[PDB]
Amino acid sequence: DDDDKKTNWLKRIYRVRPCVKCKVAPRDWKVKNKHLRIYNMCKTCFNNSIDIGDDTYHGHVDWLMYADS
Amino acid sequence: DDDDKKTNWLKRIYRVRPCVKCKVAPRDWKVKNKHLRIYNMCKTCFNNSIDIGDDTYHGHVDWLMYADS
Numbered sequence: 499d500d501d502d503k504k505t506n507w508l509k510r511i512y513r514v515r516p517c518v519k520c521k522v523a524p525r526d527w528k529v530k531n532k533h534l535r536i537y538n539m540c541k542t543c544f545n546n547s548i549d550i551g552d553d554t555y556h557g558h559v560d561w562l563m564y565a566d567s
Numbered sequence: 568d569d570d571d572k573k574t575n576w577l578k579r580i581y582r583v584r585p586c587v588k589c590k591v592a593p594r595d596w597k598v599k600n601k602h603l604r605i606y607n608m609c610k611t612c613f614n615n616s617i618d619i620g621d622d623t624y625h626g627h628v629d630w631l632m633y634a635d636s
């Protein structure tokens with residue numbers, strides 16, 4: 499089922515690239531409509547980035563959660 | 568740049584999973600609006616699937632080509 503190809507890829511994408519800051523914890527994320535938004539940092543590093551005043555690692559990548567547009 | 572994260576992932580996705588039929592050639596694809604459609608087979612195997620009458624490997628996965636929905 500092509501939807502399964504997409505699901506399996508997102509699982510892999512989420513697993514193999516951790517937080518861009520601590521490089522260990524997985525990234526924060528949210529689902530919106532038919533898209534998975536994967537933020538660049540885990541929540542701990544994102545909260546800390548606010549405290550230290552660095553926006554360098556702020557950002558996200560959105561992914562369509564199904565095979566067919 | 569988050570757009571670069573998306574581009575680099577699609578390059579990797581396209582490279583590491585070849586045609587589902589011959590398992591060697593890269594997949595056929597097309598671009599439509601802001602999406603990359605990656606078909607399940609290379610063109611050679613897809614054309615041959617028409618000749619032999621098998622729809623088993625017909626299908627595709629669409630990918631948003633940018634970081635932001």
Ligand SMILES: Nc1ncnc2c1ncn2[C@@H]1O[C@H](COP(=O)(O)OP(=O)(O)OP(=O)(O)O)[C@@H](O)[C@H]1O
Pocket residue numbers: 526537538539540541544555556557558
């Ligand atoms: N875990 C995270 N890692 C990296 N960037 C993040 C994370 N969580 C939020 N951001 C991004 O950091 C920026 C500041 O976040 P904040 O939530 O304070 O503002 P916002 O504009 O309300 O967020 P959004 O644009 O997502 O609605 C936003 O661009 C947000 O997307």
Ligand SMILES: Nc1ncnc2c1ncn2[C@@H]1O[C@H](COP(=O)(O)OP(=O)(O)OP(=O)(O)O)[C@@H](O)[C@H]1O
Pocket residue numbers: 595606607608609610613624625626627
């Ligand atoms: N290289 C390929 N690998 C796997 N499936 C493919 C490939 N090329 C086309 N297909 C799919 O095979 C099916 C039959 O293709 P064909 O092009 O004959 O019909 P179509 O309905 O015009 O295609 P589409 O739905 O993409 O417009 C369609 O679902 C098409 O998406």
Ligand SMILES: [Cl-]
Pocket residue numbers: 560561562563629630631
């Ligand atoms: Cl996607």
Ligand SMILES: [Zn+2]
Pocket residue numbers: 517518519520521522523539540541542543544
């Ligand atoms: Zn972190």
Ligand SMILES: [Zn+2]
Pocket residue numbers: 586587588589590591592608609610611612613
């Ligand atoms: Zn092939």
